[PDB]
Amino acid sequence: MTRIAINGFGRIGRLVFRAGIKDPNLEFVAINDLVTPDNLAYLLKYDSTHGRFQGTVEHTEKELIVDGKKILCVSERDPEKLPWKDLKVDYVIESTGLFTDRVGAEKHIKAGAKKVVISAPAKDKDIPTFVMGVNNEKYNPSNDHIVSNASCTTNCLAPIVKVVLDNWGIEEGLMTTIHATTATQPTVDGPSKKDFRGGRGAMQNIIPASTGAAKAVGLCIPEVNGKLTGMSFRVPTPDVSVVDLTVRTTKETSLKEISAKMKAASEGAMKGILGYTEDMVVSNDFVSSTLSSIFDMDACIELNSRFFKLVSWYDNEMGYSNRVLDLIRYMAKK
Amino acid sequence: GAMTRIAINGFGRIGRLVFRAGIKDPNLEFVAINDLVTPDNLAYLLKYDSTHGRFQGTVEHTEKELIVDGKKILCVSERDPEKLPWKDLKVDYVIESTGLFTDRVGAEKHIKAGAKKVVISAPAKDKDIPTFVMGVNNEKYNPSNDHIVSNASCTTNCLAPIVKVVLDNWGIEEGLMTTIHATTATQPTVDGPSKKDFRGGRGAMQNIIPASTGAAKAVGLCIPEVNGKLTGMSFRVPTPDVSVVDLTVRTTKETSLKEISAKMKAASEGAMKGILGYTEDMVVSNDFVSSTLSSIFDMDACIELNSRFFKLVSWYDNEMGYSNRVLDLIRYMAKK
Amino acid sequence: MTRIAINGFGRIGRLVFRAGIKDPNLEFVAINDLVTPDNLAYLLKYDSTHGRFQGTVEHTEKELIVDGKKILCVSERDPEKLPWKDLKVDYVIESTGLFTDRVGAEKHIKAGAKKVVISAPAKDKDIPTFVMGVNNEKYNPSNDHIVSNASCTTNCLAPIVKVVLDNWGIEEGLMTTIHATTATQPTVDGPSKKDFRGGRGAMQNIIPASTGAAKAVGLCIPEVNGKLTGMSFRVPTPDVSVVDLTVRTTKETSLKEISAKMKAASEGAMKGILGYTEDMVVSNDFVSSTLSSIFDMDACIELNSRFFKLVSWYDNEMGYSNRVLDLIRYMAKK
Amino acid sequence: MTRIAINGFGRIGRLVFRAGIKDPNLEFVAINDLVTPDNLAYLLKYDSTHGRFQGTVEHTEKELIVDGKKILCVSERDPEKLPWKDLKVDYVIESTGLFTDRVGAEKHIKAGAKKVVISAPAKDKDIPTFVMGVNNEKYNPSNDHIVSNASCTTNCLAPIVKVVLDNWGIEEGLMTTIHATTATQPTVDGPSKKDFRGGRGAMQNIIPASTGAAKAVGLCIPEVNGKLTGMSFRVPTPDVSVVDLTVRTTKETSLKEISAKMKAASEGAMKGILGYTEDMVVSNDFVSSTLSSIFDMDACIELNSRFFKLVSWYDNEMGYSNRVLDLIRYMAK
Ligand SMILES: NC(=O)c1ccc[n+]([C@@H]2O[C@H](COP(=O)([O-])OP(=O)(O)OC[C@H]3O[C@@H](n4cnc5c(N)ncnc54)[C@H](O)[C@@H]3O)[C@@H](O)[C@H]2O)c1
Ligand SMILES: NC(=O)c1ccc[n+]([C@@H]2O[C@H](COP(=O)([O-])OP(=O)(O)OC[C@H]3O[C@@H](n4cnc5c(N)ncnc54)[C@H](O)[C@@H]3O)[C@@H](O)[C@H]2O)c1
Ligand SMILES: NC(=O)c1ccc[n+]([C@@H]2O[C@H](COP(=O)([O-])OP(=O)(O)OC[C@H]3O[C@@H](n4cnc5c(N)ncnc54)[C@H](O)[C@@H]3O)[C@@H](O)[C@H]2O)c1
Ligand SMILES: NC(=O)c1ccc[n+]([C@@H]2O[C@H](COP(=O)([O-])OP(=O)(O)OC[C@H]3O[C@@H](n4cnc5c(N)ncnc54)[C@H](O)[C@@H]3O)[C@@H](O)[C@H]2O)c1
């Protein structure tokens, strides 16, 4: 049984917990956040986006009790003061958003944790980044003790890029994500030290945003390094995002051939990772989807035999959370 | 001085905003409004605007007219444009903004009713109606022959000036556009039927909704040099007004974002003044509510992959900018 | 087995269909709407609010196939031309919004239907109105061939009123409902001859609206006839509403005592109709709730021993759709 | 000229600044917030709700330059270390939300300010609360050095209560406010130790909230103390709220008479505070209104001659900000 601790019981932390408490192979031993177990228990059972927790939730002054299983609840701002050694934590899910650099994420290993999974792109280039179904086989159990699971957008874009790249090559690519609002944005216009637009009211605006997903894809798919960039527009929805990839391929092809390969990948080497649809879907048709990427056949367009606009959905919350579990399960086995 | 007589068929978002923008012009004379509701509901919707605020002036009504700033305007309720009294009113231009008469057969009812010229506030349903975008191809207008015209779409009016600047300076090999578009009256609040686009029937408050757009092809019409070289799509999002275009374009000559921004800023200060705007500020959509521009180039949001591959971003108030272009086109046609 | 046809496959019609199609005692034989089976099947499969249909959906040019069941699909503007006599319809669910008067509803009877259930308050004083768990025992099989299941708000308010009246009496009561947006509202400012406010954009505004639910409960609970009125505020939410009842009681009492009686009723009589909670719930905690009314203890306030403000939630879509089934089932058995 | 500093350049602080920088009798000398002048210049210039600043906005490392006027920008978390004596600050607008107690607000006076106006209800009983046009005349310049301007909801409800009470008395009143989302709420579900609902996603939910605004009216209008209580529902709108008041009056009356008195007040002794409308209004019809309260005659309902439901709108951002300025101008005269 693999022992897991969660640092940051937020949107991602609670969703990895919800997805993982079902697995007998996993054991969640601790949750760390800046609030009491009462509020953690409330946020676990009630979810404005993914519905009520399908199970029993209780709490003590010192723990949550989920389906009878006891999980320790601690509240320490500094990860170094966490009891990871006493709980002998194998994996710590770093999902606070505040320790995406190595010096901060190294604090969990100092506390006694064996492996640290950062649920976000790393700020340092020396932390390996993995996307399940793209480059997770490059993981080194003997050396990679702090890893990154990339971004929700990277996890959506990289599988699409991989199928296109494998079959027709990519000369150039520009991506746009139309992304759901997240917790980093305020409800009304407010301060924002390093991105002024990011402080504008998320309920009111379409908001241009930077994304690192494109080059992060360059990390996971080196063959596309230097050939893709991207940006983002935050829109006033609470969850589910979509990627629009304009691609110039090397070989001539058509949308029918691309769709054939996407469908094949979704049924084969990327089943459970890449999804495929021909239906007239809109974003809420993917609420609580566990897939990283859902290729939208009807929304795609072809300018000509080498220029395409490919569209893929993702639940930026639920899909990433399940990938976080998938990566841990992989690391534990291999 | 001399006055152009205008009637509005369809007193909706575009119709009321065309009225708001044009009633300030002393050379224009709005002589009639046609819609399916009595002047009482029309006065109410004219007075109060959830997006552009209260009407800055006095609005009253009778059973047969609105009274705006002392001026009386005839208010009729006739579904059939053919039964409208355009001949009696000596209507020079009819703004067809109901959304139901974008083909020649439907718009021709206004000419049969007596109007001299008809401006469709939308893309024509068929290529047999000429389309004009101010500052791009409105000089190709023929006063003696083009009696039914189209002012294209908001997206076309935003995309085309960008395309024009890029093409004239570096050429275009390919261009793929996406518009992130505000919600409009064609979408319901909750999931409902929609025969012509199933996605079009899903709830607008809840979803990102992929949609089809003809704006790319329409620009190919207004700019023949670019025909076949541009396509596009749309995503409707839960905002009530203001949209943004994201154009992925491959140029012929090598260039850079600095050079492109230089030409965009030059165009906005020169030949496309009042049509194309230019900004370097960290703007978001609500910063353009009630903007009169067709297209506002957003230098900070643009990205360059390489010397020939760029992602250009341009905003537009799909209600207010288009309504101001409808008036400009009518003014242009009047002068010649 | 009871044979049911649905006129108007909209929000209410589709949800009634979702809740009932698993029922072996019910047989849905026909669906009538203004579109062909492909759009109806699409709308049955994907719901922006209640998620994907948990089952299989197929279609023909003339029929739907749900979980193997074949349902005829028609498109007739005039109910009088519907094949109810030929299909032997026991109950017709009138959920178009256009035939809530007796002359309009009677067209289903002339076409061959035996019973018509209007999914809204009737425009006619001689059409009986029932709220399950409040006054449905007054249904007379021999005379009530066209009945009304009231409004979603009436089904929420009446259970609250029933308990308070039965235990402490009601001298006066004023109701306010904060109501989710519905299909009658536009996305942007537009015309609306019978209620100008109703035409204003639902995404942007709090919109005052009139409601008849207050007098309608006077119909179902005659003891309160003439003693309560109400109003409504439409807000930019796609589903779930809340009732805020300001009530002057006859006998002295306390919030503790009221909550205790609400809790008893939720666990015994009115079980499945009235729900009870002491948690810090918000509207999305009730998406796809099947209850008519959920009493919110913590949201309630007491001015004094005879003046209370009681709060109760309801999924105006799902709860009402389930009560339409319950009403049909009650009528069917006797 | 009155020398004013703003502590907390947020929604209220910036909107107070916009309305007041136009006033030649006022002199804004300093702004304190936790961000650099660039971000403050940005937020002053562009407003998602009230549009672009109608004027010129410039900034340096150490100041804002608004319409030619130079204003100091400081970034100090502890108000005791603020440069109020050097700047000779007459009034400090406390709009951070973190110093609504006397121990906290008094730090501005310890720092050199003469008066402190809190843009929110005070925590302490000994800090007087004023509503313009209701009880502001009770201000005592010799002793009231820290005052509260109450809440946006109290400023909307109290004028309504005053006219009803003066004409027909109040036996009971229960108020509900349908309130716009504010900076206190997250976009998505998150923690909130003292009120769990307050942490739920504001874009997707109707959110019940506690309010003291009814009880505050009991303080500003002592005759109604113990007779009025209330609650709140936060809804997914960015601005403008509405109060809904269920009132049992003492004297028999009618909606027609109440409306007449409301219209009389809006035109007379509460012009600029109380507004009156008979139109079919909705929330966005009041964006950027400077009124505290707008009586909505058509939305009102009468159960009988003594039981009414009265409805009044308010721009919780813009109306309150103007009340803060009005209070400062009153205290300075
Ligand atoms: N939201 C998404 O869709 C998404 C997708 C992929 C990855 N991510 C990444 O996951 C990370 C978390 O995102 P989220 O949306 O769950 O955010 P969130 O704000 O919902 O959760 C973060 C949580 O961390 C807790 N926390 C903060 N500081 C802490 C500390 N010092 N110690 C312990 N707990 C602390 C907070 O109370 C909060 O609940 C971010 O870095 C984000 O970029 C988010
Ligand atoms: N909304 C935008 O941003 C935008 C911008 C550019 C172009 N347009 C075009 O303008 C047209 C109208 O757009 P809108 O947003 O104003 O729509 P809208 O829903 O506001 O409708 C326009 C008006 O037409 C009236 N109408 C309907 N049938 C009529 C009839 N038979 N006779 C007279 N009036 C009738 C309606 O009552 C309505 O008020 C569409 O063709 C649209 O494509 C819209
Ligand atoms: N949505 C709610 O919260 C709610 C709650 C309780 C009851 N209701 C009542 O139920 C009724 C339906 O409301 P809704 O929200 O489902 O509306 P809706 O607009 O979602 O669905 C109504 C359907 O009627 C169909 N229709 C229209 N004309 C028709 C005709 N002539 N013949 C056949 N079908 C026709 C339409 O295509 C449409 O799908 C209303 O009367 C409403 O007041 C609504
Ligand atoms: N927004 C409304 O509708 C409204 C109406 C009436 C009253 N109020 C009250 O006014 C106050 C401000 O609310 P708001 O909506 O403007 O909030 P906001 O979050 O928009 O602004 C608060 C500001 O305080 C500043 N701040 C935080 N800590 C600080 C510190 N230590 N020193 C200096 N500045 C600091 C922050 O950067 C932030 O800009 C609150 O007390 C609120 O309850 C708000």
Author numbering:
A (entry chain A), C (entry chain C): 1 to 334
B (entry chain B): -1 to 334
D (entry chain D): 1 to 333
What did the article's authors report about this structure?
Besides carrying out moonlighting functions in the extracellular space, LiGAPDH is a glycolytic enzyme located in the cytoplasm. The quaternary structure of LiGAPDH consists in a homotetramer with O, P, Q, and R subunits related by a 222/D2 molecular symmetry, which gives rise to three non-equivalent interfaces related by three mutually perpendicular axes referred to as P, Q, and R. The monomers are composed of two domains: an N-terminal domain that contains the NAD+ binding pocket (residues 1-152), and a catalytic C-terminal domain spanning residues 153-335.
The crystal structure corresponds to the holoenzyme with an NAD+ molecule tightly bound into the active site. The N-terminal domain adopts an α/β/α Rossmann fold characterized by the classic α/β nucleotide binding pocket, which typically contains a central 7-stranded β-sheet and a tightly bound NAD+ cofactor occupying the active site. In LiGAPDH there are 8 β-strands (β1 to β8) because the canonical seventh β-strand is split into two smaller β-strands (β7 and β8) by a small irregular segment of extended conformation. Another key structural feature of LiGAPDH is the S loop, an extended and irregular segment comprising residues Ala180-Ile207 that inserts itself between the NAD+-binding site and the adjacent subunit. The catalytic Cys152 residue is located at the intersection between the N-terminal and C-terminal domains, where it interacts with the side chains of His179 and Arg234, the two other catalytic triad residues, responsible for lowering the pKa of the Cys152 thiol nucleophile. In contrast to other GAPDH structures, in LiGAPDH, well-ordered electron density was found for the residues responsible for binding the inorganic phosphate moieties of substrates and products, the so-called Ps and Pi binding sites. Inspection of the eight active sites in the crystal structure revealed that some of them had the Ps and Pi sites occupied by phosphate anions from the purification buffers or glycerol molecules from the cryoprotectant solution, which acted as substrates or substrate analogs. The crystallographic structure agrees with the solution SAXS data, suggesting that the crystal lattice has trapped the native conformation.
